[PDB]
Amino acid sequence: VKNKCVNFNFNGLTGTGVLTKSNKKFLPFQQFGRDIVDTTDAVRDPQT
Amino acid sequence: VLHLTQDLFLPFFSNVTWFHAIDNPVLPFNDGVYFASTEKSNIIRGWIFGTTLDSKTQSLLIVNNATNVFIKVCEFQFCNDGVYSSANNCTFEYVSQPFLMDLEGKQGNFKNLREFVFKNIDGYFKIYSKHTPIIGRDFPQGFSALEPLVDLPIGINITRFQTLLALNRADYYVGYLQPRTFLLKYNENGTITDAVDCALDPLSETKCTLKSFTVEKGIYQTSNFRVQPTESIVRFPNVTNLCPFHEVFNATRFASVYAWNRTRISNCVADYSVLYNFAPFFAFKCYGVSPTKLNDLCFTNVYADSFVIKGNEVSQIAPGQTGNIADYNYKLPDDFTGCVIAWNSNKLDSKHSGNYDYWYRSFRKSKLKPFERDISTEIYQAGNKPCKGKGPNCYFPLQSYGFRPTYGVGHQPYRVVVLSFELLHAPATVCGPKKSTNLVKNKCVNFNFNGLTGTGVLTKSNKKFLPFQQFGRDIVDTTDAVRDPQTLEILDITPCSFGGVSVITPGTNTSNQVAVLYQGVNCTEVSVAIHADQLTPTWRVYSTGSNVFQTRAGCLIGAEYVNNSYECDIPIGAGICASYQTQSQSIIAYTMSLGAENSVAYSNNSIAIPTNFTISVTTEI
Amino acid sequence: LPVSMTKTSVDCTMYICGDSTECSNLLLQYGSFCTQLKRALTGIAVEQDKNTQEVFAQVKQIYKTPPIKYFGGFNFSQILPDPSKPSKRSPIEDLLFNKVTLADAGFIKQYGDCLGDIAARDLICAQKFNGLTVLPPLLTDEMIAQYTSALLAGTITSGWTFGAGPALQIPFPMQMAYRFNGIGVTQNVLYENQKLIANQFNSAIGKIQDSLFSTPSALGKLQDVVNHNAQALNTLVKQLSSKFGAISSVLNDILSRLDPPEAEVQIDRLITGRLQSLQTYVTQQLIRAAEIRASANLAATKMSECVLGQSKRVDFCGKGYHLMSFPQSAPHGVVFLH
Amino acid sequence: SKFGAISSVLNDILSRLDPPEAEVQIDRLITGRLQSLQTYVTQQLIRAAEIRASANLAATKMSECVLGQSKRVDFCGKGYHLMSFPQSAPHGVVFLHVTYVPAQEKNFTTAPAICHDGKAHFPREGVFVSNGTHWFVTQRNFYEPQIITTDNTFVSGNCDVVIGIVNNTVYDPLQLE
Amino acid sequence: LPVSMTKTSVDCTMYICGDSTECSNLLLQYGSFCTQLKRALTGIAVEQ
Ligand SMILES: *[C@@H]1O[C@H](CO)[C@@H](O[C@@H]2O[C@H](CO)[C@@H](O)[C@H](O)[C@@H]2O)[C@H](O)[C@H]1NC(C)=O
Ligand SMILES: *[C@@H]1O[C@H](CO)[C@@H](O[C@@H]2O[C@H](CO)[C@@H](O)[C@H](O)[C@@H]2O)[C@H](O)[C@H]1NC(C)=O
Ligand SMILES: *[C@@H]1O[C@H](CO)[C@@H](O[C@@H]2O[C@H](CO)[C@@H](O)[C@H](O)[C@@H]2O)[C@H](O)[C@H]1NC(C)=O
Ligand SMILES: *[C@@H]1O[C@H](CO)[C@@H](O[C@@H]2O[C@H](CO)[C@@H](O)[C@H](O)[C@@H]2O)[C@H](O)[C@H]1NC(C)=O
Ligand SMILES: *[C@@H]1O[C@H](CO)[C@@H](O[C@@H]2O[C@H](CO)[C@@H](O)[C@H](O)[C@@H]2O)[C@H](O)[C@H]1NC(C)=O
Ligand SMILES: *[C@@H]1O[C@H](CO)[C@@H](O[C@@H]2O[C@H](CO)[C@@H](O)[C@H](O)[C@@H]2O)[C@H](O)[C@H]1NC(C)=O
Ligand SMILES: *[C@@H]1O[C@H](CO)[C@@H](O)[C@H](O)[C@H]1NC(C)=O
Ligand SMILES: *[C@@H]1O[C@H](CO)[C@@H](O)[C@H](O)[C@H]1NC(C)=O
Ligand SMILES: *[C@@H]1O[C@H](CO)[C@@H](O)[C@H](O)[C@H]1NC(C)=O
Ligand SMILES: *[C@@H]1O[C@H](CO)[C@@H](O)[C@H](O)[C@H]1NC(C)=O
Ligand SMILES: *[C@@H]1O[C@H](CO)[C@@H](O)[C@H](O)[C@H]1NC(C)=O
Ligand SMILES: *[C@@H]1O[C@H](CO)[C@@H](O)[C@H](O)[C@H]1NC(C)=O
Ligand SMILES: *[C@@H]1O[C@H](CO)[C@@H](O)[C@H](O)[C@H]1NC(C)=O
Ligand SMILES: *[C@@H]1O[C@H](CO)[C@@H](O)[C@H](O)[C@H]1NC(C)=O
Ligand SMILES: *[C@@H]1O[C@H](CO)[C@@H](O)[C@H](O)[C@H]1NC(C)=O
Ligand SMILES: *[C@@H]1O[C@H](CO)[C@@H](O)[C@H](O)[C@H]1NC(C)=O
Ligand SMILES: *[C@@H]1O[C@H](CO)[C@@H](O)[C@H](O)[C@H]1NC(C)=O
DSSP: OOSSOEEEEETTEEEEEOOOOOOOOOOTTOOBOOOTTOOOOOBOOTTO | OOOEEEEEEOOTTOOEEEEOOOOOOOEEOOSOEEEEEEOSSOOOOOEEEESTTSTTSOEEEOOBOSSOBOOEEEOOOOOOOOOOSOOTTOBOOOOOSOSOOOOOSSSTTOOEEEEEEEEOTTSOEEEEEEEEEEEOSSOOOSOOOOEEEEEEOOOOOOOEEEEOOOOOOOEEEEEEOEEEEEEEEEOTTSOEEEEEESSSOHHHHHHHHTTSSOOOSEEEEEEOOOBOOSOEEOOOOSOOOBOTHHHHHTOSOOOOGGGOEEEEEOSEEOOTHHHHHTOOOSBOOBSSSOTTTTTTOEESOEEEEEEEEOHHHHHTOSBTOOSTTTTTTOOBOTTOOEEEEEEEOSSSSOOTTOBOOOOEEOOOSSOOOSSOOOOOOOOEEOTTOOOOSSSSSEEOSEEOOOBOSOOOGGGSOEEEEEEEEOOSSSOOSEEOSOOOOOOOOSSOEEEEETTEEEEEOEEOOOOOOOTTOOBOOOTTOOOOEEEOTTTOOEEEEOOOSOOOEEEEEOOTTTOSOOEEEEETOOHHHHHHHHHTTOBSOOOOOOOOSSSOEEETTEEEESOEEOSSOOOOSEEOSSSEEEEEEEOOEEEEEEEOOOSOBOOOOOOSSOOEEESOEEEEEEEEO | OBOOOOEEOOOHHHHHSTTOHHHHHHHGGGOTHHHHHHHHHHHHHHHHHHHHHHHHTTOSSBOOOOSSOOBTTBOOTTTSOOSSSTTOOOHHHHHHHHTOOOSOOSTTOOTTSSGGGOSSOOHHHHHHTTTOOEEOOSSOTTHHHHHHHHHHHHHHHSTTGGGTSSOOOOOHHHHHHHHHHTTTOOHHHHHHSHHHHHHHHHHHHHHHHHHHHHSSOSOHHHHHHHHHHHHHHHHHHHGGGOOTTSSOSOHHHHHHHSOHHHHHHHHHHHHHHHHHHHHHHHHHHHHHHHHHHHHHHHHHHHIIIIITSOOOSTTTSSSSSOOOOEEEEETTEEEEEO | OOTTSSOSOHHHHHHHSOHHHHHHHHHHHHHHHHHHHHHHHHHHHHHHHHHHHHHHHHHHHIIIIITSOOOSTTTSSSSEEEEEEEEEETTEEEEEEEEEEEOOEEEOOBOSOEESSSSEEEESSSEEEESSSSEEEEOSSSOOOBOOBTTTEEEOSOSSSSTTOEEOOOBOTTTOO | OOOOOOOOOOOHHHHHSTTOHHHHHHHHTTOSTTHHHHHHHHHHHHHO
8 A cells, every 4th residue: 555654564674654656766686775864765565 | 875885895996817818717716706808799608616626615606508597506526628527415506597698789899898796795695797888898997887686695615716718610807806995976866876985095085984076175084094013022921831730630539519629820831722632521611711712811820629510510600600519519709700611520430339439518507608618517507406416407518429430411420620810910920822922122013911912112111110010001091011021121112103194185176186194193104104014094195205294283295395375275283284286286285374474664753544445345154 | 361272183993992803893883973073073173273263363464563662662572572582472472381381282293202201101192092182273383473473563553453454554652642532531641641651551561471470370271271171181091991891991801802702792881981981071072162162252352352452341351441452372372461 | 873782673673572682672772872862962952052152142243233333343344344234044144244444545744742832732533644744633544634723633731741742833713813 | 141050069979879889889990980070060160
């Protein structure tokens, strides 16, 4: 579910927040996301 | 983002060996290998890894082919030219998409520059690659990031490394990785656009500690510099008598725990190899020290308490332990610095018809405080009878460790000895078997004086060490002087070189030249240290004789002193300022100009009155 | 008034983990707790440089006293620089320098004689032994003296005009008359008792030199600053001998005594003690630097008003009706003669 | 930053360790993060004290330079201050100190007083200045020579105690009338 | 205008270790973490 506050357990990465489609340019080996302060930003959907 | 990482990378502008082909040298492998090649269609199949490449140690093979790969872990014999001849104890086969990709624009002109990087960090064999259709004829210098392809937890030992060839009827670019710190600039699309090393140039290091790619004009404090020691001296005492460990171990009538025989060991050299030899060890659990690092330590005094006890009681003997032995028989202090040795002795504490020679205390009026013997036969009181005898309510305090050659593991006569050391500040009469090297003075070295480890510079002294004095210090309680054990002379101790490096640069948009300032150090010392290559900094900034300036604030390398005076542009310290001035452009340091030299026309009757005026608007923020 | 404090460039890596790779690796587990401290000390050092710059570098052009020195009777030889002295400092300026003792000059490059210390190695050698160094000020006490000479020559040859724009020469008797007229007494008073006022000025200037000479310490503020800095640094270095609940207080010892997986606990305790002590030092230095910045801003304001002009604000530039003010450089501070 | 814990992720070490195992690590993370937050709070307090000092300076500068003329030199800009105009800035203020600064000046001559007839004349306000041959009186910060009359100067003295007096004739507008 | 604040002179020895010899010995292992605080507060009072 997107655009709704949820607790996610994406591939063992636990946390809470809101998810949605992005226009990222994830490399084919790219799996996770982060930012300048090293906090998980985006997750590649394992089943999508 | 300008994320900073610390991992294995090929150092910038490092050495890369370029080979040819027309036999196939075995390149050593360590800390990862950067691989690159540029071929027309295909001449390099794969690589071979492992140790000694024979049928005695597991090896690797990553041979590619037209459609797939052939990654495997096996113990091949040799091929001396299918690719092998032995697959006996060989598993972990693997097949996936081919690593090599080739595209041509209807012409063989294009020679994709294929680059690879491998490593073996905690197993997990990592492979990175990137194919640049750009012909690599001349090793390109533009940036090209490397994408991982596969990552398989190989878990073997890799030291050597080889490569394969093709058949037919300018390549092989190899470099070695090293643990370095890198700063990487990530593009908005997530790719990497530019990266900078952090141990290559003073500018690069400043850029790293000021994480950015544009460094504005100024002086930046980045790190420090230290003269790494050249030699390592160990000066142990003038005694060679081996310790009496043999006598206590070669004894047979190890007394009971109620009377723990305590021997004093002093004035000897303790080589614990003899401790290992007479010891089918069962429990060598050491607390204050590491049993591996016992031949390099000096102890003021060594005690050895020997007592034979039962199987569970050895796990019951420890610093601040409890139980029938650790409360009334033998109690180790909480801050115990030493350890216990236990090995089964069923041939010396046993015989046919049985043996009951040993003893142990079960009944004591109170707990046994650490390191006390309580040899006494007083019947423990129960209830309120002053009874003096045996029977009920009148118990003989200490019961027997009857030992026969037939007990379970929990009951065999375990021979236990404990070693207690005193690792404090006092002349150590007991030291490890380490050899005493020579003494070198006026040179930064690592010293181990009588077990006192440290680093610095040593020399003669004019102190008045009293005969009992052994150390030196200051109001700050830092070891200053050490009396030589084998010379009985006083040696001062100096810091290694500790200082501080500040890079002085104009903006990177202006020039890449920088000025390095080592803080509070005579520049002759840093020059000899540089010439001896014992300086911790690896960015060896050039020294042409014209770029050295012993400032009152340290010494400046990379800027030439000009006797002129200009406005202060980049503050250095102690009346020195650096600036980027034309010659055709270079960095110059100068004594700051405080202002235009002016002299007033003061006189008895001369006055100056402005015949005009100006309005100026200044700004204050 | 204090103007600046000793500039330090604490390096936590050497201070907390003397050349220990394992200790450094465990320290990297504490995040950027270090770059914060290094940045704070760098900012304090730059702030001290800026304080001295604001206090003294007020005059763009460096002025000089005329070759002849007859200021209508006023005797200024006590505050003018002495050409005979190699350091080119005022007689009243020399006393301040000789009455203040710096524990660490910073501009010594003392390395090379710690081995040659012969006797017990001193505070500076000990501080160098544990990653604790002192930077020197950007402005030397020789060119600061020339700033002060320029400020003094500008206020005796040009009155207050040099504090506004071009320095306009004016005879000192007339400058005295103008300062007098600035506090409500007509010039004729000065021009009728010029000799008497010159005698009083000379006597007061002469007797302030002895008042500073014979007093135990009238510079207690500057010596207070120096003692506070040296004492904080000494308390910092003294924390290296505190076990903090570890087996021993020596990293090279507990590293050579315990194998890594066990010694990590003791090294972590040492880290968490020494980092806390270093943060205490940095915070106290920041507070002292804020206080010194306030004092240096006050001194800069006092210079700009009392020196480069007459201040109508009562009791600000000394007690009584202010006339002028001659600055004199002092170790890590400035001294005014109101 | 792990602070010596197993991991730096709360939701991880909670889901990877039962309370007793997590407790120790959770305590380590708390004692690390709380210490970092105290460092941040202390730095913010010190910076806020410094900014308050600067803001009190700015308030004094506004109240003096803007709402009036400041006689204190080098406070409201360099030179003789005339007026000021504040300008709002992001997290601060910018002043425009309009200052009167002198210009081209000429050596003329000067004397403390002028003795006309046995009596010393001093300027009521301004300097006694000389072209070179005709003595004049003028203001201090601008050369506006004026004929030395008995209203431009006040007389008090005896022509024998002032050092540097110069002989000249003063003018009185009453004798002619 | 405030001119002064209350002059406090807390003693760390009692404040942390109320009349406990064991706690005093454990505190001694922390070095001069106490003289620093005492000197700071004494300076504060003198400055008040
Ligand atoms: C990140 O990726 C975007 C998606 O491909 C790029 O945008 C494209 O730009 C090209 C022109 O270069 C267009 O033809 C295309 O329609 C799309 O707009 C974008 O440039 C890229 N940014 C980078 C690589 O920095
Ligand atoms: C513990 O047992 C040791 C070995 O038997 C004793 O050492 C030896 O004791 C003999 C006498 O039995 C000495 O002749 C010999 O030189 C050596 O010291 C040791 O004394 C003993 N200690 C106690 C406290 O019983
Ligand atoms: C005082 O100074 C003014 C500028 O600083 C002078 O004004 C100048 O006037 C000339 C024309 O005469 C212009 O060309 C010039 O741009 C400037 O505006 C002014 O003349 C001067 N007065 C005296 C008496 O020196
Ligand atoms: C200005 O004041 C100086 C004070 O140092 C006078 O110097 C004096 O010189 C005499 C020798 O003639 C010394 O005995 C005395 O101790 C002092 O150093 C100086 O003469 C004086 N000059 C004028 C013009 O007033
Ligand atoms: C003294 O001041 C006088 C100002 O009144 C100047 O004299 C002027 O001279 C002209 C003729 O040269 C007269 O026409 C005029 O009325 C005035 O008297 C004179 O230049 C000045 N002296 C010097 C040396 O500048
Ligand atoms: C100013 O003018 C006075 C008379 O108008 C001068 O007084 C004279 O002084 C001389 C001695 O120098 C006497 O001999 C004479 O009788 C008269 O009193 C005075 O000197 C003069 N001063 C200057 C500086 O020119
Ligand atoms: C996941 O598996 C299902 C069933 O095998 C398949 O229909 C689907 O396409 C798969 N999706 C992904 C992303 O692998
Ligand atoms: C690479 O090797 C060559 C061959 O000896 C050498 O001249 C060069 O200095 C090496 N590169 C560097 C960066 O030292
Ligand atoms: C290439 O390797 C694959 C891997 O099993 C193998 O099946 C194939 O026969 C090999 N040769 C070609 C031409 O694909
Ligand atoms: C595999 O290893 C075992 C180890 O004991 C060895 O006995 C066996 O001969 C090996 N298999 C071979 C050499 O084919
Ligand atoms: C790996 O091989 C090297 C080279 O012989 C050897 O020194 C090292 O001990 C080996 N390591 C292991 C874990 O086998
Ligand atoms: C005692 O010494 C002899 C010497 O030959 C040795 O064989 C034996 O193992 C020793 N016994 C012990 C318990 O050390
Ligand atoms: C050390 O021992 C050797 C050999 O017994 C001797 O020659 C030398 O003098 C001794 N030195 C000292 C200081 O005792
Ligand atoms: C430091 O300065 C120079 C340059 O090295 C030399 O005299 C000596 O090494 C040192 N001198 C002193 C006085 O420390
Ligand atoms: C020029 O500089 C040199 C040192 O590089 C110095 O010895 C010389 O005195 C200077 N000349 C002048 C005129 O300042
Ligand atoms: C000023 O007057 C004094 C004493 O009359 C004299 O010594 C000095 O040379 C005079 N200087 C000038 C510039 O007139
Ligand atoms: C005043 O005269 C002196 C004497 O040479 C000269 O140096 C100075 O520049 C003059 N001032 C002026 C013209 O403003």
